[PDB]
Amino acid sequence: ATQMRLTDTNLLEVLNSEEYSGVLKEFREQRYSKKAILYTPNTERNLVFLVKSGRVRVYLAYEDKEFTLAILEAGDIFCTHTRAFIQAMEDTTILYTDIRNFQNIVVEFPAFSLNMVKVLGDLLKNSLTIINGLVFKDARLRLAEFLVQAAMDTGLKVPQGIKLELGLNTEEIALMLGTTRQTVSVLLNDFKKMGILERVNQRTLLLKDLQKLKEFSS
Amino acid sequence: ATQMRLTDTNLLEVLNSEEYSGVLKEFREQRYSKKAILYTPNTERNLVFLVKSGRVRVYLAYEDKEFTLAILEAGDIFCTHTRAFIQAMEDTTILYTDIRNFQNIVVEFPAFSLNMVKVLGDLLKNSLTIINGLVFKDARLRLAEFLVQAAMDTGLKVPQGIKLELGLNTEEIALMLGTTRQTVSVLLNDFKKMGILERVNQRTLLLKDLQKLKEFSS
Ligand code: HEM
Numbered sequence: 339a340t341q342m343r344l345t346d347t348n349l350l351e352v353l354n355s356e357e358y359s360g361v362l363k364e365f366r367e368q369r370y371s372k373k374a375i376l377y378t379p380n381t382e383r384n385l386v387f388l389v390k391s392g393r394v395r396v397y398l399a400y401e402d403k404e405f406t407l408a409i410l411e412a413g414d415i416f417c418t419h420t421r422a423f424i425q426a427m428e429d430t431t432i433l434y435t436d437i438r439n440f441q442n443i444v445v446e447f448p449a450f451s452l453n454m455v456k457v458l459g460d461l462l463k464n465s466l467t468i469i470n471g472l473v474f475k476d477a478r479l480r481l482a483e484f485l486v487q488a489a490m491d492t493g494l495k496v497p498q499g500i501k502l503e504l505g506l507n508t509e510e511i512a513l514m515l516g517t518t519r520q521t522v523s524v525l526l527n528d529f530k531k532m533g534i535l536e537r538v539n540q541r542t543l544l545l546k547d548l549q550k551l552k553e554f555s556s
Numbered sequence: 557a558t559q560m561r562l563t564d565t566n567l568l569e570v571l572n573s574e575e576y577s578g579v580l581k582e583f584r585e586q587r588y589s590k591k592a593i594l595y596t597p598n599t600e601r602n603l604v605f606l607v608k609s610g611r612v613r614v615y616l617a618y619e620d621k622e623f624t625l626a627i628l629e630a631g632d633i634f635c636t637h638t639r640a641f642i643q644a645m646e647d648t649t650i651l652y653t654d655i656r657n658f659q660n661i662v663v664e665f666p667a668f669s670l671n672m673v674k675v676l677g678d679l680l681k682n683s684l685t686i687i688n689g690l691v692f693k694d695a696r697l698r699l700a701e702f703l704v705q706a707a708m709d710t711g712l713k714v715p716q717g718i719k720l721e722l723g724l725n726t727e728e729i730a731l732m733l734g735t736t737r738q739t740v741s742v743l744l745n746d747f748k749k750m751g752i753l754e755r756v757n758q759r760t761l762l763l764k765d766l767q768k769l770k771e772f773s774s
């Protein structure tokens with residue numbers, strides 16, 4: 339149950355119905371091994387593709403860092419006409435078609451725009467997090483370090499993850515880290531939206547993805 | 557006008573058609589005065605709305621500055637469950653419904669998701685430009701001031717713009733501005749994406765919006 343979805347049925351199931359038979363015809367199949375770069379930004383051949391199996395990372399690449407924009411799973415649509423790089427996170431099979439062909443089927447077969455909405459919403463979600471993370475780069479680093487440090491020092495193992503009884507509210511965390519209550523508030527909300535953590539009570543957080551948070555502390 | 561569109565017809569027009577009977581009455585109307593804040597990030601009520609008339613700015617707000625993500629115009633869909641502020645740029649009338657009602661609408665009436673794709677694409681395009689702008693803040697400013705100077709020195713008026721001769725290729729410009737070749741190209745392509753210019757080759761640019769470019773030199 340990927341949270342950006344507007345429908346409960348996977349697009350691959352829909353495409354393999356007989357009401358959608360003939361749309362499949364216009365797609366070709368390509369395989370990619372783990373870590374293979376599928377596409378560099380704005381490729382010469384404008385393609386719309388569908389992930390058939392595996393996981394694909396859509397990302398902005400710079401010299402010293404990369405920002406993940408989205409992770410495409412089975413049934414997710416994307417294209418080659420963005421400023422993003424596209425990499426296979428695991429052994430991957432895609433189905434692809436020329437853009438001129440997809441123009442027709444997106445207006446005719448409703449299930450496609452529904453998935454695009456889900457994928458573009460996810461990309462925008464991660465983009466806003468990235469922008470917040472750049473505006474508050476230093477505060478974010480300090481907060482993530484504070485939390486990972488607390489997790490290792492006093493974190494408690496629970497079935498959902500690591501419970502952090504910080505004994506500090508957001509105001510007090512901001513004081514500890516030399517930022518504002520408002521900034522820590524934005525950043526914690528962002529960590530929640532990333533599925534990194536949940537709020538247990540005023541002074542307690544549940545760290546559900548420590549390993550991921552360890553990437554923001556570097 | 558936006559090139560993100562997958563249709564030529566306005567959602568407000570489609571909402572008047574027979575096939576869409578009953579949909580309109582699922583929305584209520586609210587008027588907003590010029591400069592009024594419609595919604596703060598993630599308001600108590602989770603709503604989907606359509607701009608009936610006026611123009612609405614979607615933006616990120618920090619204590620120092622704001623980043624505009626999109627201008628929504630008549631016929632555009634947005635929601636109240638994002639981390640952005642939403643402000644009326646002029647006297648505005650919106651049509652709003654609870655998200656739980658919109659769930660049924662978006663699945664059965666295809667025009668809504670097509671408009672969402674256009675809107676989300678425009679927000680994402682603006683978002684990626686913002687990200688690049690933050691990562692390369694210094695280099696961006698120095699490039700903009702170079703291009704404004706080059707316009708003053710070499711600029712020849714042509715229909716729809718100003719032809720610039722830089723006298724330098726991308727590597728040489730990079731050396732001059734104390735940056736990498738890769739950063740110059742990325743920022744030049746972003747200026748293209750913003751409608752500021754076209755790249756004829758490494759040495760020649762067509763400037764379509766000098767005024768907007770002077771905003772990056774400030
Ligand atoms: C019907 C087929 C499609 C058409 C005709 C189309 C057309 C376009 C056009 C003309 C642009 C540039 C608009 C501008 O100048 O602002 C664009 C950008 C973009 N499109 Fe598509 N597109 C299609 C399918 C898709 C799909 C399947 C996706 C992925 C879900 C997608 C995602 C994007 C994104 C993220 C951008 C902005 C890229 C950037 O700023 O680097 N599009 N599209």
Ligand code: HEM
Pocket residue numbers: 341342343344459462463464466531604605633634635637638639640655656658659660662672675676
């Ligand atoms: C019935 C229709 C809708 C449903 C079921 C829905 C559902 C959701 C859910 C569950 C999330 C949070 C995803 C997560 O947990 O990561 C979300 C986020 C988001 N949605 Fe929607 N939504 C709908 C309509 C819309 C509309 C109309 C728009 C605007 C065109 C939109 C744009 C966004 C954006 C930009 C986010 C990310 C917000 C942020 O990160 O600040 N959604 N949606």
